[PDB]
């Protein structure tokens, strides 16, 4: 399975996939034939004209490890399926996204970037210590967790078809999206390209609305 | 690929599937483990309590040949993907659903059922003859086809996840649904049972709302 | 209520609407203020950049009378709500779309267009006569109706938000769509313009993908 | 507009509504009549048999102020529309949900509940102080906010139809849901009952799956 490390402790991994470029061609044609130049031209035609329903017949499942603030943005994509770790039902692990000092490149700051990174580490350590103190005193998990910060890592399974994935890439593989989710979208794109090369190349050429891919 | 004949000239065929019973278990648990009693109990637990999002991670693609009046009902299931043969873009084939005389069992009629079957065959033959006359006189396809009856066969690809498929089975594998679409739903159920035995058995035991399966 | 005649016997009527241009502005801003240049500029900004979720907070309900082949295309728009007259549960009325001879403008035909119109009327009359014969002999409605042609009129209620309506207009108020549904989309557009002038004008300027509106 | 205070600093307010009980009746019947015992019986019939599409023609818009951990759960309801305050684009206000000591009723704790409440207040104060320090040193908002806890208040507009609202009530007006979101769902229910009394009463009698309403 293709797995790609993201941020300091995150990842994207492909769990499963149904279909390939030919799945869209066969759905478009409503083919009996389960047997090229013509198939690739059909994908380009569909993409250039906005005929994207055939790409709904290609489906992916990913396992993603990401901070909560990234997952909040990601879960706004309603045309998909999600199942996520629960802070009601589980004790949550001490794992936080701590930005690199390079995260602040281009910003002039009155605290050195290495000190910003330190201050973030210090406050999330204090928050986790309070979380644990509450848990260990008998406070229910679902209440104790409310002190934890948005940079806490979470994990989820995401099942999404290629049409909705292309929408995700338009929006998230783009400079207007937050840099952290851009990094995830770059990995999603790499996996999509590997699994569906003709669809992906046609997408970049004719339909992709963002400004970071190729 | 599993294929099942339906009605006089129809079929349902499985084109592809992503996942199996374990896909729902792994999504529910957000598992790293890609490795029983415990997995089957989890599926039953989910089903008995209405926790059905994990079943969205199992996906099917079918190729279906059905009369238009069956397809009209089927396409009301919005949480799915469809691509269908077009009467704008193609010449449509002379293939009609002609009910068997047994279709009228339990109804007292003042025309013998064999004569009902004959009258249906006769009018659809006349309609197709008019369609062809129009086509052959230069009338555009998209206009000529408007004379064709609702028992004309059509074909489509359908991609659907197991949660939405279970909704389809609740509604269509049921005595209140039209008998013709019941027959399709029985075939969809057979394929679902073969591919996802634990999910299907748990569905019948705990969640299925209809009155025809088992 | 705004009502517009379409084709020979069809219509589109607005039944209800929630909101107006300001609904999108207030949702975008998450406003407490329930109180111009600034509001119109926000709508244009949203539209020009593809930020269309705020328009989901404007909702319409229409009552539409259209032939079945138009309704088949229309009902492919899944992000909406429909309720339609049933040929299982009701006797269907003798009302058919008969194209005008002008429908064939630009096509050279070997049957005069007035004779095409006559041949269509003649076959649908024969089909309805068979339908009625079957009904009156005790054949269940749901079976008798299968002989009826795709130009039979049907009626439905459609509830749709402005984002999905704009998608509908991109696709259906366009020369590539069948002329008959174009005529419906023109009426939908007129009603949308009346109810949401700033959104509609911004849509035409920045986002509309079709080639018939203004 | 109906507004209801929730938790310590939260609220639910109705912003707009389209339709009423009669909207579902008129959609079900595909009525021309825009004019009782019969209308209420139709709603009960629909509800008792699971025929819930007609209720999609009743739509609500709410403005909700809730902590992020409540909003995370709420936003899992995909069949709806949301627009939320952004921590990328805005400075976020110092407003946190601090549980009442009574929140821990039924739990034996080794820290007195008043001290739990104090410890939660203390850590979120420290987190906000770090957030502000980062902002005021020139760290971009979208990065500074990652230290803020899940009990931070957020606000959003929610547009939802009555069918999806009933699903929300089944799931969230229920003892298995987290107590905090139960409190929101109780307020949503009160507003739904006021606006759609026949639908709500039929829902409670025939369809509601939860264990807290009436
Ligand atoms: C840079 C950026 C900044 C953002 N800022 C904010 C913000 O400040 N606040 C905020 O709340 N959100 C914000 N968002 C989130 C944004 O509003 C969308 O929720 C998100 O981008 C998902 O887009 P989508 O609706 O196209 O995706 P999906 O929800 O996956 O929908 C896919 C497609 O299905 C259709 N669709 C799905 N459901 C409906 C429906 N109910 N009605 C109509 N059409 C539907 C649309 O065609 C849509 O494109 C931001 C997103 C980005 C990328
Ligand atoms: C016996 C029978 C008779 C019928 N008679 C008629 C009739 O006379 N007229 C008629 O028009 N239709 C009729 N229908 C069709 C019926 O109204 C539904 O369109 C169909 O059964 C599909 O059901 P669904 O909406 O659950 O499926 P899908 O559209 O696949 O939706 C699946 C689920 O997603 C949710 N959902 C999807 N979209 C929305 C949305 N926009 N809002 C809220 N929830 C949503 C719901 O939880 C729904 O159960 C009939 C169906 C049956 C089975
Ligand atoms: C000129 C023309 C010719 C056509 N020819 C054919 C044909 O030959 N055969 C045929 O079968 N169909 C045909 N169609 C129908 C077409 O494939 C679409 O079904 C229809 O245009 C509705 O578009 P939509 O999916 O954008 O709308 P909706 O279904 O309303 O969806 C709205 C938006 O929500 C999103 N969306 C909704 N559901 C999903 C999902 N499951 N996955 C991903 N994204 C989703 C997409 O962003 C979509 O744009 C044709 C349409 C047109 C206009
Ligand atoms: C007590 C409780 C505990 C929970 N625990 C967890 C947890 O540990 N982890 C977790 O990730 N989530 C958890 N959830 C969230 C839960 O999985 C659902 O996301 C949430 O309840 C919304 O339900 P829904 O999908 O029915 O709603 P919506 O998303 O609004 O969907 C409404 C209806 O539309 C249909 N539907 C919509 N989209 C699809 C689709 N893509 N495929 C098929 N059908 C569709 C279904 O019929 C559905 O009922 C929990 C929820 C509750 C109430
Ligand atoms: N908006 C819109 N969406 C669409 C289409 C469309 O025309 N418009 N259609 C393009 N279609 C095909 C199918 C087969 C071939 C081919 O065999 N050559 C070419 C195109 C199928 C369908 C898919 N979705
Ligand atoms: N992206 C980025 N990187 C940087 C800086 C910057 O402004 N932006 N600069 C911040 N600078 C200092 C030095 C001393 C103090 C102080 O003592 N208080 C504060 C800041 C040094 C320098 C380090 N690298
Ligand atoms: N309405 C609703 N929907 C839900 C759930 C829920 O509680 N309510 N949840 C049940 N969940 C799991 C996950 C793992 C195990 C297990 O490991 N034992 C058990 C249950 C996941 C999630 C899926 N959807
Ligand atoms: N389901 C079903 N099957 C049937 C019948 C029926 O009523 N229902 N009956 C209809 N019956 C006749 C006989 C003669 C004429 C006539 O000459 N006019 C008309 C009907 C015969 C019988 C045949 N089988
Ligand atoms: N893809 C995408 N979708 C979006 C947005 C976005 O940035 N990208 N956002 C634009 N947003 C607003 C809200 C208020 C104002 C204003 O007050 N000036 C301006 C913009 C809200 C949100 C809506 N949807
Ligand atoms: N759009 C359109 N309009 C038309 C025609 C046409 O080709 N296209 N033409 C078809 N023409 C005739 C005349 C006689 C016969 C015949 O007797 N067989 C058949 C066709 C006449 C003319 C009438 N108007
Ligand atoms: N699953 C399912 N969904 C449905 C229906 C159905 O039968 N099954 N139908 C019930 N329908 C009506 C319409 C009018 C009346 C009446 O006038 N008496 C009664 C029922 C409309 C439609 C709505 N959705
Ligand atoms: N819901 C709930 N309410 C409670 C308690 C409880 O267990 N659950 N109890 C906790 N109790 C104390 C007293 C002293 C210390 C200590 O000094 N360490 C710690 C706990 C007192 C009492 C207060 N009210
Ligand atoms: O780039 C963005 C900005 C916002 N949001 C959505 C996610 C949350 O529901 C809400 C606020 O997100 P933040 O701006 O706080 O990340 O809007 C996104 O999806 N992407
Ligand atoms: O059993 C039914 C009856 C109706 N419909 C939907 C399909 C059409 O959109 C409309 C009318 O269908 P008929 O009753 O004419 O089949 O309602 C169904 O989906 N299933
Ligand atoms: O312009 C078109 C052509 C096709 N279809 C969809 C509707 C039917 O599900 C199927 C076949 O439609 P016809 O081409 O037969 O109209 O594809 C459309 O929605 N619009
Ligand atoms: O009662 C619950 C529990 C979980 N979730 C969803 C929301 C988040 O996406 C994820 C984790 O939620 P918490 O258990 O951490 O609240 O699962 C709910 O929607 N409701
Ligand atoms: Cl840990
Ligand atoms: Cl043929
Ligand atoms: Cl009549
Ligand atoms: Cl403040």
């Amino acid at each position: 399975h293709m797995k790609i490390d993201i941020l300091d402790k995150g990842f994207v991994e492909l769990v499963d996939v149904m279909g390939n470029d030919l799945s869209a061609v066969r759905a478009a044609r409503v083919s009996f034939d389960m047997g090229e130049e013509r198939d690739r031209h059909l994908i380009e035609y569909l993409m250039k004209h906005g005929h994207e329903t055939p790409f709904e017949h290609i489906v992916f499942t990913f396992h993603v490890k990401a901070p909560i603030f990234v997952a909040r943005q990601w879960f706004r994509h309603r045309i998909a399926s999600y199942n996520e770790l629960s802070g009601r039902y589980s004790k949550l692990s001490y794992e936080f996204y701590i930005p690199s000092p390079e995260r602040l490149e281009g910003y002039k700051t009155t605290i050195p970037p290495e000190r910003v990174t330190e201050k973030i580490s210090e406050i999330v350590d204090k928050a986790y210590r309070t979380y644990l103190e509450l848990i260990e005193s008998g406070v229910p998990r679902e209440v104790a967790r409310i002190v934890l910060p948005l940079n806490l890592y979470t994990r989820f399974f995401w099942t999404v078809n290629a049409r909705s994935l292309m929408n995700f890439l338009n929006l998230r593989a783009d400079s207007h999206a937050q840099w952290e989710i851009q990094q995830y979208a770059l990995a999603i794109a790499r996996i999509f390209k590997e699994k569906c090369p003709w669809t992906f190349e046609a997408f970049l050429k004719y339909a992709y609305k963002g400004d970071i891919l190729k």
Side-chain angles (χ1 to χ4, degrees), chain A residues 2-32 34-214:
Chain A
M2 296 180 74
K3 181 181 192 196
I4 302 169
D5 294 340
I6 325 287
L7 313 182
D8 53 350
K9 301 156 182 143
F11 64 73
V12 169
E13 176 178 339
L14 186 68
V15 171
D16 208 351
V17 56
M18 187 181 69
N20 55 27
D21 291 316
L22 296 190
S23 303
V25 166
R26 283 167 184 179
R29 296 182 182 143
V30 199
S31 291
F32 285 113
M34 301 293 115
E36 42 141 312
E37 179 174 37
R38 84 184 299 249
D39 297 348
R40 189 165 195 166
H41 287 331
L42 179 52
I43 288 164
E44 294 180 319
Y45 174 88
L46 293 170
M47 198 71 71
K48 70 172 57 143
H49 292 95
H51 304 167
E52 285 199 27
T53 55
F55 301 105
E56 297 176 18
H57 303 273
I58 301 166
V59 187
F60 300 87
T61 299
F62 299 94
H63 182 185
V64 179
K65 177 179 175 197
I68 290 175
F69 70 96
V70 168
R72 284 181 68 237
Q73 296 171 358
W74 201 316
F75 278 48
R76 296 301 300 280
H77 293 264
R78 297 162 290 180
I79 308 301
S81 300
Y82 302 87
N83 192 253
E84 183 178 6
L85 296 182
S86 170
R88 302 186 64 209
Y89 294 105
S90 300
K91 178 189 190 280
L92 301 169
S93 294
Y94 189 130
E95 286 202 84
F96 297 97
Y97 166 60
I98 306 304
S100 76
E102 294 76 15
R103 181 58 178 85
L104 303 182
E105 179 201 355
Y107 295 95
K108 194 167 202 160
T109 58
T110 55
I111 291 178
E114 290 281 16
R115 184 71 193 129
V116 172
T117 284
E118 292 179 3
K119 288 172 82 93
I120 295 171
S121 291
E122 289 171 353
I123 188 66
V124 308
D125 182 72
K126 292 182 182 77
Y128 198 90
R129 163 175 318 110
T130 298
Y131 169 66
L132 189 60
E133 284 171 351
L134 300 178
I135 292 287
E136 296 186 334
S137 78
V139 174
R141 255 175 256 105
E142 65 178 13
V143 174
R145 59 66 176 277
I146 73 182
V147 303
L148 292 173
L150 292 169
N151 65 342
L152 184 73
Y153 276 95
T154 190
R155 296 189 291 103
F156 60 99
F157 273 40
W158 187 39
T159 292
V160 62
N161 73 45
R163 184 181 191 187
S164 181
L165 183 156
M166 282 182 283
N167 187 62
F168 175 92
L169 294 178
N170 281 336
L171 289 161
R172 306 306 181 169
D174 185 69
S175 67
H176 299 89
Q178 182 157 354
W179 181 84
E180 284 80 4
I181 201 166
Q182 293 178 36
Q183 295 281 294
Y184 285 87
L186 285 168
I188 296 294
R190 193 188 318 169
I191 291 164
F192 180 38
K193 180 177 167 164
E194 180 81 61
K195 295 301 179 196
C196 300
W198 299 343
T199 300
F200 183 78
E201 219 51 35
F203 173 62
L204 292 194
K205 188 170 187 177
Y206 296 111
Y208 173 58
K209 296 173 194 166
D211 62 3
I212 70 175
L213 298 176
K214 292 194 77 276

PDB file of all heavy atoms in Angstrom, chain A residues 41-57:
ATOM      1  N   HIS A  41      -8.396   9.121 -25.274  1.00  0.00           N
ATOM      2  CA  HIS A  41      -9.110  10.238 -25.875  1.00  0.00           C
ATOM      3  C   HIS A  41     -10.492  10.441 -25.273  1.00  0.00           C
ATOM      4  O   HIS A  41     -10.923  11.587 -25.114  1.00  0.00           O
ATOM      5  CB  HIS A  41      -9.204  10.093 -27.391  1.00  0.00           C
ATOM      6  CG  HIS A  41      -7.907  10.349 -28.101  1.00  0.00           C
ATOM      7  ND1 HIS A  41      -6.938  11.203 -27.610  1.00  0.00           N
ATOM      8  CD2 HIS A  41      -7.430   9.882 -29.279  1.00  0.00           C
ATOM      9  CE1 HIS A  41      -5.915  11.234 -28.448  1.00  0.00           C
ATOM     10  NE2 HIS A  41      -6.185  10.436 -29.466  1.00  0.00           N
ATOM     11  N   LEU A  42     -11.175   9.348 -24.915  1.00  0.00           N
ATOM     12  CA  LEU A  42     -12.494   9.472 -24.264  1.00  0.00           C
ATOM     13  C   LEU A  42     -12.353  10.166 -22.908  1.00  0.00           C
ATOM     14  O   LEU A  42     -13.121  11.080 -22.587  1.00  0.00           O
ATOM     15  CB  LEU A  42     -13.206   8.121 -24.129  1.00  0.00           C
ATOM     16  CG  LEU A  42     -14.573   8.217 -23.423  1.00  0.00           C
ATOM     17  CD1 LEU A  42     -15.501   9.272 -24.052  1.00  0.00           C
ATOM     18  CD2 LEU A  42     -15.266   6.846 -23.386  1.00  0.00           C
ATOM     19  N   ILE A  43     -11.368   9.768 -22.108  1.00  0.00           N
ATOM     20  CA  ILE A  43     -11.154  10.430 -20.835  1.00  0.00           C
ATOM     21  C   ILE A  43     -10.855  11.905 -21.011  1.00  0.00           C
ATOM     22  O   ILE A  43     -11.391  12.724 -20.274  1.00  0.00           O
ATOM     23  CB  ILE A  43     -10.050   9.751 -20.026  1.00  0.00           C
ATOM     24  CG1 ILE A  43     -10.581   8.410 -19.521  1.00  0.00           C
ATOM     25  CG2 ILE A  43      -9.564  10.670 -18.896  1.00  0.00           C
ATOM     26  CD1 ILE A  43      -9.495   7.483 -19.051  1.00  0.00           C
ATOM     27  N   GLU A  44     -10.021  12.254 -21.987  1.00  0.00           N
ATOM     28  CA  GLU A  44      -9.744  13.668 -22.225  1.00  0.00           C
ATOM     29  C   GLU A  44     -11.003  14.431 -22.658  1.00  0.00           C
ATOM     30  O   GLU A  44     -11.235  15.544 -22.198  1.00  0.00           O
ATOM     31  CB  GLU A  44      -8.636  13.840 -23.267  1.00  0.00           C
ATOM     32  CG  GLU A  44      -7.268  13.333 -22.806  1.00  0.00           C
ATOM     33  CD  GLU A  44      -6.192  13.520 -23.866  1.00  0.00           C
ATOM     34  OE1 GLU A  44      -6.453  13.296 -25.068  1.00  0.00           O
ATOM     35  OE2 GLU A  44      -5.076  13.893 -23.484  1.00  0.00           O
ATOM     36  N   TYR A  45     -11.809  13.815 -23.505  1.00  0.00           N
ATOM     37  CA  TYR A  45     -13.053  14.412 -23.973  1.00  0.00           C
ATOM     38  C   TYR A  45     -13.984  14.701 -22.820  1.00  0.00           C
ATOM     39  O   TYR A  45     -14.524  15.797 -22.673  1.00  0.00           O
ATOM     40  CB  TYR A  45     -13.740  13.487 -24.986  1.00  0.00           C
ATOM     41  CG  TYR A  45     -15.117  13.985 -25.393  1.00  0.00           C
ATOM     42  CD1 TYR A  45     -15.258  14.867 -26.455  1.00  0.00           C
ATOM     43  CD2 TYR A  45     -16.264  13.599 -24.703  1.00  0.00           C
ATOM     44  CE1 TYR A  45     -16.504  15.341 -26.827  1.00  0.00           C
ATOM     45  CE2 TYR A  45     -17.515  14.072 -25.067  1.00  0.00           C
ATOM     46  CZ  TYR A  45     -17.625  14.942 -26.129  1.00  0.00           C
ATOM     47  OH  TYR A  45     -18.856  15.416 -26.521  1.00  0.00           O
ATOM     48  N   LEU A  46     -14.163  13.704 -21.958  1.00  0.00           N
ATOM     49  CA  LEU A  46     -15.038  13.855 -20.815  1.00  0.00           C
ATOM     50  C   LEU A  46     -14.555  14.995 -19.940  1.00  0.00           C
ATOM     51  O   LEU A  46     -15.328  15.860 -19.505  1.00  0.00           O
ATOM     52  CB  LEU A  46     -15.075  12.555 -20.005  1.00  0.00           C
ATOM     53  CG  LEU A  46     -15.731  11.361 -20.685  1.00  0.00           C
ATOM     54  CD1 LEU A  46     -15.485  10.094 -19.908  1.00  0.00           C
ATOM     55  CD2 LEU A  46     -17.243  11.570 -20.921  1.00  0.00           C
ATOM     56  N   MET A  47     -13.262  15.002 -19.642  1.00  0.00           N
ATOM     57  CA  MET A  47     -12.686  16.005 -18.768  1.00  0.00           C
ATOM     58  C   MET A  47     -12.771  17.417 -19.349  1.00  0.00           C
ATOM     59  O   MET A  47     -13.135  18.352 -18.629  1.00  0.00           O
ATOM     60  CB  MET A  47     -11.229  15.634 -18.459  1.00  0.00           C
ATOM     61  CG  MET A  47     -10.639  16.301 -17.272  1.00  0.00           C
ATOM     62  SD  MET A  47     -11.314  15.705 -15.721  1.00  0.00           S
ATOM     63  CE  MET A  47     -10.636  14.038 -15.558  1.00  0.00           C
ATOM     64  N   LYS A  48     -12.471  17.561 -20.627  1.00  0.00           N
ATOM     65  CA  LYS A  48     -12.459  18.895 -21.216  1.00  0.00           C
ATOM     66  C   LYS A  48     -13.873  19.488 -21.285  1.00  0.00           C
ATOM     67  O   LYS A  48     -14.030  20.699 -21.186  1.00  0.00           O
ATOM     68  CB  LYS A  48     -11.723  18.917 -22.549  1.00  0.00           C
ATOM     69  CG  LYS A  48     -12.368  18.237 -23.661  1.00  0.00           C
ATOM     70  CD  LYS A  48     -11.610  18.508 -24.974  1.00  0.00           C
ATOM     71  CE  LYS A  48     -10.137  18.094 -24.900  1.00  0.00           C
ATOM     72  NZ  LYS A  48      -9.592  17.502 -26.161  1.00  0.00           N
ATOM     73  N   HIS A  49     -14.892  18.640 -21.378  1.00  0.00           N
ATOM     74  CA  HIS A  49     -16.265  19.123 -21.463  1.00  0.00           C
ATOM     75  C   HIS A  49     -17.050  19.124 -20.167  1.00  0.00           C
ATOM     76  O   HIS A  49     -18.241  19.456 -20.182  1.00  0.00           O
ATOM     77  CB  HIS A  49     -17.003  18.316 -22.512  1.00  0.00           C
ATOM     78  CG  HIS A  49     -16.515  18.575 -23.893  1.00  0.00           C
ATOM     79  ND1 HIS A  49     -15.574  17.784 -24.515  1.00  0.00           N
ATOM     80  CD2 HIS A  49     -16.805  19.573 -24.762  1.00  0.00           C
ATOM     81  CE1 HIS A  49     -15.319  18.275 -25.718  1.00  0.00           C
ATOM     82  NE2 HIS A  49     -16.053  19.358 -25.891  1.00  0.00           N
ATOM     83  N   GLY A  50     -16.423  18.762 -19.052  1.00  0.00           N
ATOM     84  CA  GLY A  50     -17.113  18.761 -17.781  1.00  0.00           C
ATOM     85  C   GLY A  50     -18.053  17.590 -17.550  1.00  0.00           C
ATOM     86  O   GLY A  50     -18.912  17.636 -16.677  1.00  0.00           O
ATOM     87  N   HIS A  51     -17.876  16.517 -18.298  1.00  0.00           N
ATOM     88  CA  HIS A  51     -18.736  15.346 -18.173  1.00  0.00           C
ATOM     89  C   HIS A  51     -18.131  14.432 -17.138  1.00  0.00           C
ATOM     90  O   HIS A  51     -17.485  13.446 -17.510  1.00  0.00           O
ATOM     91  CB  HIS A  51     -18.801  14.603 -19.490  1.00  0.00           C
ATOM     92  CG  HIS A  51     -19.262  15.440 -20.630  1.00  0.00           C
ATOM     93  ND1 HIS A  51     -19.144  15.044 -21.944  1.00  0.00           N
ATOM     94  CD2 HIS A  51     -19.825  16.670 -20.647  1.00  0.00           C
ATOM     95  CE1 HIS A  51     -19.653  15.985 -22.723  1.00  0.00           C
ATOM     96  NE2 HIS A  51     -20.062  16.985 -21.963  1.00  0.00           N
ATOM     97  N   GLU A  52     -18.324  14.736 -15.874  1.00  0.00           N
ATOM     98  CA  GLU A  52     -17.508  14.068 -14.858  1.00  0.00           C
ATOM     99  C   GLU A  52     -18.190  12.931 -14.131  1.00  0.00           C
ATOM    100  O   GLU A  52     -17.532  12.234 -13.367  1.00  0.00           O
ATOM    101  CB  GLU A  52     -16.887  15.033 -13.859  1.00  0.00           C
ATOM    102  CG  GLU A  52     -15.711  15.817 -14.456  1.00  0.00           C
ATOM    103  CD  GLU A  52     -14.779  16.433 -13.415  1.00  0.00           C
ATOM    104  OE1 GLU A  52     -14.659  15.922 -12.259  1.00  0.00           O
ATOM    105  OE2 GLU A  52     -14.165  17.463 -13.769  1.00  0.00           O
ATOM    106  N   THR A  53     -19.479  12.684 -14.363  1.00  0.00           N
ATOM    107  CA  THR A  53     -20.108  11.555 -13.724  1.00  0.00           C
ATOM    108  C   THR A  53     -19.378  10.213 -13.958  1.00  0.00           C
ATOM    109  O   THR A  53     -19.359   9.395 -13.030  1.00  0.00           O
ATOM    110  CB  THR A  53     -21.618  11.432 -14.062  1.00  0.00           C
ATOM    111  OG1 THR A  53     -21.803  11.395 -15.468  1.00  0.00           O
ATOM    112  CG2 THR A  53     -22.444  12.547 -13.424  1.00  0.00           C
ATOM    113  N   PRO A  54     -18.767   9.968 -15.129  1.00  0.00           N
ATOM    114  CA  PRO A  54     -18.148   8.637 -15.273  1.00  0.00           C
ATOM    115  C   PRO A  54     -17.018   8.369 -14.272  1.00  0.00           C
ATOM    116  O   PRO A  54     -16.760   7.206 -13.918  1.00  0.00           O
ATOM    117  CB  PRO A  54     -17.606   8.662 -16.692  1.00  0.00           C
ATOM    118  CG  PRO A  54     -18.629   9.552 -17.422  1.00  0.00           C
ATOM    119  CD  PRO A  54     -18.857  10.665 -16.421  1.00  0.00           C
ATOM    120  N   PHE A  55     -16.378   9.419 -13.795  1.00  0.00           N
ATOM    121  CA  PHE A  55     -15.288   9.279 -12.834  1.00  0.00           C
ATOM    122  C   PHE A  55     -15.782   8.919 -11.463  1.00  0.00           C
ATOM    123  O   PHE A  55     -14.974   8.528 -10.602  1.00  0.00           O
ATOM    124  CB  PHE A  55     -14.443  10.566 -12.834  1.00  0.00           C
ATOM    125  CG  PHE A  55     -13.869  10.855 -14.194  1.00  0.00           C
ATOM    126  CD1 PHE A  55     -14.394  11.861 -14.991  1.00  0.00           C
ATOM    127  CD2 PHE A  55     -12.864  10.051 -14.740  1.00  0.00           C
ATOM    128  CE1 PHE A  55     -13.917  12.088 -16.261  1.00  0.00           C
ATOM    129  CE2 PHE A  55     -12.390  10.287 -16.016  1.00  0.00           C
ATOM    130  CZ  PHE A  55     -12.927  11.301 -16.788  1.00  0.00           C
ATOM    131  N   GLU A  56     -17.079   9.006 -11.196  1.00  0.00           N
ATOM    132  CA  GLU A  56     -17.632   8.532  -9.931  1.00  0.00           C
ATOM    133  C   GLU A  56     -17.524   7.020  -9.744  1.00  0.00           C
ATOM    134  O   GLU A  56     -17.695   6.537  -8.621  1.00  0.00           O
ATOM    135  CB  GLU A  56     -19.107   8.949  -9.784  1.00  0.00           C
ATOM    136  CG  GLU A  56     -19.298  10.453  -9.743  1.00  0.00           C
ATOM    137  CD  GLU A  56     -20.755  10.854  -9.707  1.00  0.00           C
ATOM    138  OE1 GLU A  56     -21.632  10.038  -9.385  1.00  0.00           O
ATOM    139  OE2 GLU A  56     -21.032  12.065  -9.921  1.00  0.00           O
ATOM    140  N   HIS A  57     -17.232   6.285 -10.810  1.00  0.00           N
ATOM    141  CA  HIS A  57     -17.113   4.831 -10.749  1.00  0.00           C
ATOM    142  C   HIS A  57     -15.705   4.339 -10.360  1.00  0.00           C
ATOM    143  O   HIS A  57     -15.463   3.131 -10.356  1.00  0.00           O
ATOM    144  CB  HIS A  57     -17.610   4.204 -12.043  1.00  0.00           C
ATOM    145  CG  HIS A  57     -19.021   4.567 -12.379  1.00  0.00           C
ATOM    146  ND1 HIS A  57     -20.113   3.866 -11.913  1.00  0.00           N
ATOM    147  CD2 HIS A  57     -19.502   5.612 -13.089  1.00  0.00           C
ATOM    148  CE1 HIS A  57     -21.225   4.462 -12.355  1.00  0.00           C
ATOM    149  NE2 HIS A  57     -20.878   5.508 -13.094  1.00  0.00           N
TER     150      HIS A  57
END
